[PDB]
């Protein structure tokens, strides 16, 4: 429904929606921007990520509330409503994965862009995995793993160890290991090696880049504290 | 789209949506419950009010953000997006007013129910007034006034001065006077008389009712402090 709006107007309205904390509108404006077919700039990639992370973040928090109530109960209403929220969440994940597959990833040739979109692919498969069960859960877990792994391979070859997207990728792949793949040792090892390699590279950074990197290193630290 | 769901199931799902902070779902479930045609209990009236107050509250906060940006700017994008939010807000207000008019108010014979719904009618016209301009603004302001005034007349005849809905009605009618009707003296007079008459009636209340009443008296107090 955004096909008649100018790309630049969609981007401007995404930024306005962000200011107004209207994340569903923001995601719809950024979906329309992507569907114009042009590659996204660094700023525009961040708008896309913020919009959907806020939308899906709300759905995940709601799904968790409903799942807890449902598990305690174990009428059809709690299950029915958890399933409705779950379906809506899956639809948002499938929408984001669709944008990545058509055709953000294939056109992304620079390390910054390709790693950013593959991290997103890992994250949205991870969200699908959280609500999945059975073997269904297995192929979804492997899709999240594969995307994270390709992103990690490129980030290690192409980016310094303090690059914020490299750090955030490692952070989320470590959460995948801990929370999804039942590999807490792999999670802890990855977060520790990532933290230590970034610490050794901080001396190369300006004040502002130091601020950006140490913020994400603190997130790695917070997880290690929680997990150990 | 709720016509096939049992009334009791809609109410149960409204309560679940509230727990999950899913207020748009909560409002839709309560709209479906109202549309069953039966009167609402005290608990159900509160669910209806909470759902829509949260939905419209989000829209008002967003509209305010966008209006501020628009006024500072004075391309079409900020105006266009403020108008989109404004239209959505008006649609939610019209939906609530429609439920009150078809047929909650006319079937409400007890003071508690009638005052509750007339206060809601005042509030949703007040929200329409906030975004209205011109003469358009005048008929809307008069509709909010009329609803508040009928509610006040019944509350003074039928309820004690500490009744929480009577207090909340007076609180919101005083905000109407201050913020909409440009009658700050009427606002201050109403909040002060309401506060003083409730204070004189507190001695009649249980511990729990005392807690309920003094909470709203503090809201009256907070406004008087802001306005004086
Ligand atoms: Cl979350
Ligand atoms: Cl449902
Ligand atoms: Cl390429
Ligand atoms: Cl508000
Ligand atoms: Cl718009
Ligand atoms: Cl009646
Ligand atoms: Mg164009
Ligand atoms: Mg390219
Ligand atoms: Mg029935
Ligand atoms: Mg009746």
From Swiss-Prot, chains A, B:
Tissue specificity of this protein: Present mainly in tissues enriched in stratified squamous keratinizing epithelium.
Instruction: Output the superkingdom of the source species.
Output: Eukaryota
The record ties this protein, via PROSITE patterns, to: 1433_1, 1433_2
Q: Which organism is it from?
A: Homo sapiens (Human)
Q: How does it assemble?
A: Homodimer. Interacts with KRT17 and SAMSN1. Found in a complex with XPO7, EIF4A1, ARHGAP1, VPS26A, VPS29 and VPS35. Interacts with GAB2. Interacts with SRPK2. Interacts with COPS6. Interacts with COP1; this interaction leads to proteasomal degradation. Interacts with the 'Thr-369' phosphorylated form of DAPK2. Interacts with PI4KB. Interacts with SLITRK1. Interacts with LRRK2; this interaction is dependent on LRRK2 phosphorylation.
As one GO molecular function, the record gives: phosphoserine residue binding
Query: Which residues bear the site annotation Interaction with phosphoserine on interacting protein?
Result: 60, 126
**What's in the keyword line of the UniProt record?**
Cytoplasm, Nucleus, Phosphoprotein, Secreted, Ubl conjugation
* Protein family per UniProt: Belongs to the 14-3-3 family.
Q: Which PANTHER family match?
A: 14-3-3 PROTEIN (PTHR18860)
Q: What is this protein called?
A: 14-3-3 protein sigma
User: Which CDD domains does the UniProt record give?
Assistant: 14-3-3_sigma (cd10019)
Q: Which gene specifies this protein's sequence? A: SFN
* Phosphoprotein is among the record's keywords: yes
For biological process, the GO terms are: cAMP/PKA signal transduction; establishment of skin barrier; intrinsic apoptotic signaling pathway in response to DNA damage; keratinization; keratinocyte development; keratinocyte proliferation; negative regulation of innate immune response; negative regulation of keratinocyte proliferation
* Function recorded in the entry: Adapter protein implicated in the regulation of a large spectrum of both general and specialized signaling pathways. Binds to a large number of partners, usually by recognition of a phosphoserine or phosphothreonine motif. Binding generally results in the modulation of the activity of the binding partner. Promotes cytosolic retention of GBP1 GTPase by binding to phosphorylated GBP1, thereby inhibiting the innate immune response. Also acts as a TP53/p53-regulated inhibitor of G2/M progression.
Q: How is it modified after translation?
A: Ubiquitinated. Ubiquitination by RFFL induces proteasomal degradation and indirectly regulates p53/TP53 activation.
Taxonomic lineage: Eukaryota, Metazoa, Chordata, Craniata, Vertebrata
Q: Where are the transmembrane segments?
A: none
> Does Phosphoprotein show up as a keyword for this record?
yes
Residues folding into a coiled coil are none
Gene3D superfamilies referenced in this protein's UniProt entry, alphabetically: 14-3-3 domain
Q: Which residues carry this modification: Phosphoserine?
A: 9
Q: Where in the cell is it found?
A: Cytoplasm; Nucleus; Secreted
């Amino acid at each position: 429904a955004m096909g008649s709006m100018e790309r630049a107007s969609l981007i401007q309205k995404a930024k306005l929606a962000e200011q107004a904390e209207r994340y569903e509108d923001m995601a719809a404006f950024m979906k329309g921007a992507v569907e114009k077919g042009e590659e996204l700039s660094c700023e525009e990639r961040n708008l896309l990520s913020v919009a959907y992370k806020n939308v899906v973040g709300g759905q995940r928090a709601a799904w968790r509330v409903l799942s807890s109530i449902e598990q305690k109960s174990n009428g059809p209403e709690v299950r029915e409503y958890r399933e409705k929220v779950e379906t809506e969440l899956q639809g948002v994940c499938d929408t984001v994965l669709g944008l990545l597959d058509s055709h953000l990833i294939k056109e992304a040739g620079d390390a910054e862009s390709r790693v950013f979109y593959l991290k997103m692919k890992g994250d949205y498969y991870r969200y699908l995995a959280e609500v999945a069960t059975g073997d269904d859960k297995k192929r979804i877990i492997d899709s999240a793993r594969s995307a994270y792994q390709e992103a990690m391979d490129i980030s290690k070859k192409e980016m310094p160890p303090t690059n914020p997207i490299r750090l955030g990728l490692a952070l989320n792949f470590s959460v995948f290991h801990y929370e999804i793949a039942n590999s807490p040792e792999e999670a802890i090892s990855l977060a520790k090696t990532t933290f230590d390699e970034a610490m050794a590279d901080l001396h190369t950074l300006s004040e502002d880049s130091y601020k950006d990197s140490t913020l994400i290193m603190q997130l790695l630290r917070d997880n290690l504290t929680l997990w150990t």
